[PDB]
Design a protein around this ligand. Sequence first.
Ligand SMILES: Nc1ncnc2c1ncn2[C@@H]1O[C@H](COP(=O)(O)OP(=O)(O)OC[C@H]2O[C@H](O)[C@H](O)[C@@H]2O)[C@@H](O)[C@H]1O
Ligand SMILES: Nc1ncnc2c1ncn2[C@@H]1O[C@H](COP(=O)(O)OP(=O)(O)OC[C@H]2O[C@H](O)[C@H](O)[C@@H]2O)[C@@H](O)[C@H]1O
Ligand SMILES: Nc1ncnc2c1ncn2[C@@H]1O[C@H](COP(=O)(O)OP(=O)(O)O)[C@@H](O)[C@H]1O
Ligand SMILES: Nc1ncnc2c1ncn2[C@@H]1O[C@H](COP(=O)(O)OP(=O)(O)O)[C@@H](O)[C@H]1O
Ligand SMILES: [Mg+2]
Ligand SMILES: [Mg+2]
Lengths: 96, 400, 398, 185, 185
Amino acid sequence: SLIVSTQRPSELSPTVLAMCSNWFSLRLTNERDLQALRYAMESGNEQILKQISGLPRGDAVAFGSAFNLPVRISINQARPGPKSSDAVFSEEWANC
Amino acid sequence: SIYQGGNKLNEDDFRSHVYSLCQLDNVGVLLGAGASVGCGGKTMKDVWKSFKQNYPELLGALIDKYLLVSQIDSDNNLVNVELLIDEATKFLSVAKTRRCEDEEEEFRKILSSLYKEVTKAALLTGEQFREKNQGKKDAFKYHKELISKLISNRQPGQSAPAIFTTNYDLALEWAAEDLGIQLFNGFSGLHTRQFYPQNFDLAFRNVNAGHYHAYLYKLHGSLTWYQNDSLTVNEVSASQAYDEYINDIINKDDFYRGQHLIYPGANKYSHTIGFVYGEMFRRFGEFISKPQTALFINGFGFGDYHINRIILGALLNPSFHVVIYYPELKEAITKVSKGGGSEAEKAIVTLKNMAFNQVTVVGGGSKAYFNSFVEHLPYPVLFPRDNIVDELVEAIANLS
Amino acid sequence: SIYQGGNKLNEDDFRSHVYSLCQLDNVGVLLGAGASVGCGGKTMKDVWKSFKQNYPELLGALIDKYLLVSQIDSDNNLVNVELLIDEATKFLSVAKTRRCEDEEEEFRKILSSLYKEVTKAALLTGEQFREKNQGKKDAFKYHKELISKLISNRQPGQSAPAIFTTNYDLALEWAAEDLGIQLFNGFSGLHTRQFYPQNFDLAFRNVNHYHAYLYKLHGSLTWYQNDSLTVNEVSASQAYDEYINDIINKDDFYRGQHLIYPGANKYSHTIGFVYGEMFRRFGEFISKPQTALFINGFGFGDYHINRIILGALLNPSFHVVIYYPELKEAITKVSKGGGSEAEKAIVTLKNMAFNQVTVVGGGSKAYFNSFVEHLPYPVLFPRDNIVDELVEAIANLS
Amino acid sequence: LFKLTEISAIGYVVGLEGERIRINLHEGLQGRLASHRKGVSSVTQPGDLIGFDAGNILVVARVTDMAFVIPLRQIIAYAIGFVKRELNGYVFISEDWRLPALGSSAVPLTSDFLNIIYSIDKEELPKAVELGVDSRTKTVKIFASVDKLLSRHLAVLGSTGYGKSNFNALLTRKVSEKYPNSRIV
Amino acid sequence: LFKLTEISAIGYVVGLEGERIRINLHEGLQGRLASHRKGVSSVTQPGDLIGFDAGNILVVARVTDMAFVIPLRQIIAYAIGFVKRELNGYVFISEDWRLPALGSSAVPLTSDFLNIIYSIDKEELPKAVELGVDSRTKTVKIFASVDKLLSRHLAVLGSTGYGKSNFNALLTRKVSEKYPNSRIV
Ligand SMILES: Nc1ncnc2c1ncn2[C@@H]1O[C@H](COP(=O)(O)OP(=O)(O)OC[C@H]2O[C@H](O)[C@H](O)[C@@H]2O)[C@@H](O)[C@H]1O
Ligand SMILES: Nc1ncnc2c1ncn2[C@@H]1O[C@H](COP(=O)(O)OP(=O)(O)OC[C@H]2O[C@H](O)[C@H](O)[C@@H]2O)[C@@H](O)[C@H]1O
Ligand SMILES: Nc1ncnc2c1ncn2[C@@H]1O[C@H](COP(=O)(O)OP(=O)(O)O)[C@@H](O)[C@H]1O
Ligand SMILES: Nc1ncnc2c1ncn2[C@@H]1O[C@H](COP(=O)(O)OP(=O)(O)O)[C@@H](O)[C@H]1O
Ligand SMILES: [Mg+2]
Ligand SMILES: [Mg+2]
């Protein structure tokens, strides 16, 4: 089994994306990254794709075989989370 | 044991079939004397045993003199009880007309025993027959469920359910007066009730924009209908009827009035009493001649000729459906296969072998009783299945 | 603390639940005697306590000679005062008609003392009951906020809020006249003001957010019946000069069918009409679909009102919110055994499995000044007061 | 003494034009909220869910338009399935080729049916992990069967700074505590 | 002498066809210009911002169409976010699925709410640098955070003779002034 996490669905093998069963999608603002998702899945539902362009921070739209109908979800906060971040300039420039 | 044109079908298919016939234009139900046996009633062959065990002296004269009943039937408990009272009334009437004084006592004495026997079995509560709120007892728990299920699955712009019966007791009235439903039965008034046959075409509506009513056709009469001195038919309440004439019938031993009572199909020779009986049959025949009808039968023994004749003729219409409950197929199939049984068995088995999809027969003993009939019927999604009102009523009563 | 349906809630869910109930078709409020103790009023316990201290001679007669009151509740301070006054009035009328001299003068003392005690505690400002602009003072700060928040939350085309109360003081009128609001209380006219029950069916209109309704269930200090068989209303100054001054600084009780507070003189068919109309209108309001009600300051010691409220829950679209400070004490006293009828009545509905009932308890988190802030202001409501700084300059030009 | 439904109505169907539905509201509803035995629900904003009672089933629809036509108001909706009762509970079917009748009442959807709509099978509950809550109302909890997730492949997509790593951490940590005899690299 | 609002309205909502809003305008100058305690405001052309009263929130929208239907005039608009109260002031949230109800009135946006829409998160002010002023009205100052701006790479683009060197010089000089221990090449 594979789990893939990318911010550029358009730079992927067309066969790899088309052969999944569950899709989670956070905010995706680019007209060429939405076409990949459009062609990966079937037709019959267009009112649901217009949401993805304006999702807030921390929401998702899930659809697949583990879901009877597509849902818009507000995901919980993990505890403890991953490593915080990289370095910050202000602290080092003010360490006189 | 479920059949449809000779082919056995499982339970789930039968349930999906019943679910589909409950959403047609017209829906009806026919009930017999076995449908009120869970409340305190008796069948027709339990009445004959009591009569022939209590009055063994009239039985000889009623067979060997007037030829009103056969030996084979009275030995096998196969007597048609309400077909004998009519003939007895005819005999008494002719004897009264031609003034034969010795023959009047012999019939006034046996008509006083036949009523004393059939009347007592229809009270269902004994001495509590004249009290109020009889519909709150546990014997009438399934009549309410039937009435409630029938009304709750109609869509706007559709007809009301219709109910026919051969019982002449008060079970359905008591059940319906507790839910708050109103049943039309052809009578109107309070200080004088009178029979108006034309009000079977009336209905209710709401002035602001309600649809809570049904029709009830009593084929053999009722205990509360009688004909006073004038030639009009009246209806009273149970308390009033008990205080007027029922008490004396049950207690006094030489009480017979005359052409007074309107049960069970007795005084048919009179031309103002047969009018009431004729209308019910005309409207029954009219109901089942419609494009999208579905009729359920339960409690009926198929021992009648006119009803069977009407039911057979209504099947030559490609959109009429029937469902039949009969808890004795096994004991009839063999008796017909070997030599042939009785007329009821012959009728039911000729109906079972028909190669239609429009007939369905159900058997299996207790699996085809009245109580099992109710749960085969659907149940609406938005119908409230809880108990909230009663708790508030208890709290209100507890206050102060 | 906060209960809904038998389990517990938190502050944020409760505050979000209050807001959605103010946007329904009908909205109402029921206020008791505890809503006026923050501006100068008193509770019934205090009134009985002060009477029992001041008049120790008349207290024996009521208990022994005439059986109008029992000993245990007199000791515990749990007597109903307006019922006592009504019974005394009935006694006096019967004695008067059958011509008994000994009892007629006996009951006058009791009645005059009871009116002195209950009138003295309803004048919220003392000697300044006469003067004008009484609603400009700081004691009436939260009544104005209540009225403002309750009017400004309605969308156009929705009905106006309705207010019921068991008080007979003038706090709400003084508060509403200072904002610039008009209340409909069932009277009309100036030089002769009379009661018309059909004034409750009218509303204003602009021919080029003005009004509310006020229902007083126990009367008012400014209502009286004259020699003519009609009921009148006068202003505070006129009533003070006419009959309120003598009640306090004199031994004056000589008219027995005159005052219309508190719930007294119910045996006269001209005076009972007013009370009957008020109560019928209250009963009709909570029978409508899509209704919400808030209750605060009211101790559940009335049988008729409890009977009415419980029977209204049978409709699926009626919701109610109740405030009761002394809740833990009631719970313990009824679990251990005992308690009066109020405690049993409130506890039995706290424990129901209904999502239409909410109970809020606390010490001072269920007071009147805590009820008002749970109600929200709209985003565009003006709050910065900058017309008074201009009025002071205008008067300073002189 | 008879109660056919313990819920009030919103409007009634006045037209059918193929697969779209047209509804007329009553006179009292102005504040976009309706109440029942369980609480208060919103009914008029586009994107909401409502239902019509058709015999012994409930048909579920979603709101698209709302306009004027005291003047009258109107609503347009589309159907996405129906809810059915079988033994003692309910099930949700995703076939949407059935329409109500003229005069059919329109009702709000309470929170009990909303749990039925976004539910998984009862026998698979021991095989489920929790992700979050419903986004529009924040009342219902969302579960998923692990067997149906990690059987085929799975995809996670998004821009930078919106929460991909958070979801990955949350998902992968839970699976270790449920199927400890599993290989993850 | 009781007032509900001290700023006067411009029109009212008459439709919601999906993500669009349709507005009808009052007659005369009442539908273009407003005067209030702090100045004068107007909505006149596509590109302006408008607001709707919705109880305890204020919905923010942008104009796209204007036309003749004295004749009657109409507008189309789209939603961005909303405003609410926090402690004693306000804050701006940027979700765009909430819409106003029919019959709501539309008002223009004062500069006091514009100062709130274009602000930063109330704590990065000690590390913020001023760049300019908003172009349309020129009454709101624009600030940016140093840690977020100079974290990853930055891109300045444009033709010749239009002002790249001005911007580079300004930014570098007032970053050197704030943190005198900086390293720049
Ligand atoms: N608990 C039960 N549930 C259902 N059916 C039952 C039950 N108990 C017995 N049965 C069946 O109930 C039936 C009882 O049949 P009977 O009372 O003799 O017949 P009728 O009611 O038509 O008699 C009146 C008719 O007589 C003239 O023909 C006129 O036409 C009258 O209409 C049997 O099949 C029992 O097995
Ligand atoms: N500051 C406060 N804020 C709110 N509630 C308070 C406050 N102080 C006390 N309370 C509570 O307020 C309540 C005071 O209860 P009482 O004044 O005796 O009751 P009533 O106004 O119904 O009495 C009149 C009734 O008499 C007949 O029964 C008729 O029904 C009349 O209507 C207590 O719970 C206090 O703890
Ligand atoms: N559902 C959520 N709830 C709360 N905080 C979140 C959520 N999703 C993301 N965040 C926050 O966003 C920050 C960065 O998100 P991250 O997962 O690193 O984004 P990405 O990896 O997609 O760039 C984290 O510190 C996290 O706390
Ligand atoms: N913000 C500004 N305000 C006023 N003048 C400007 C501004 N930005 C650029 N200019 C003008 O543009 C001219 C040259 O721009 P320059 O900085 O050389 O742009 P570039 O390097 O892209 O050619 C200067 O004379 C300056 O006056
Ligand atoms: Mg990451
Ligand atoms: Mg240059």
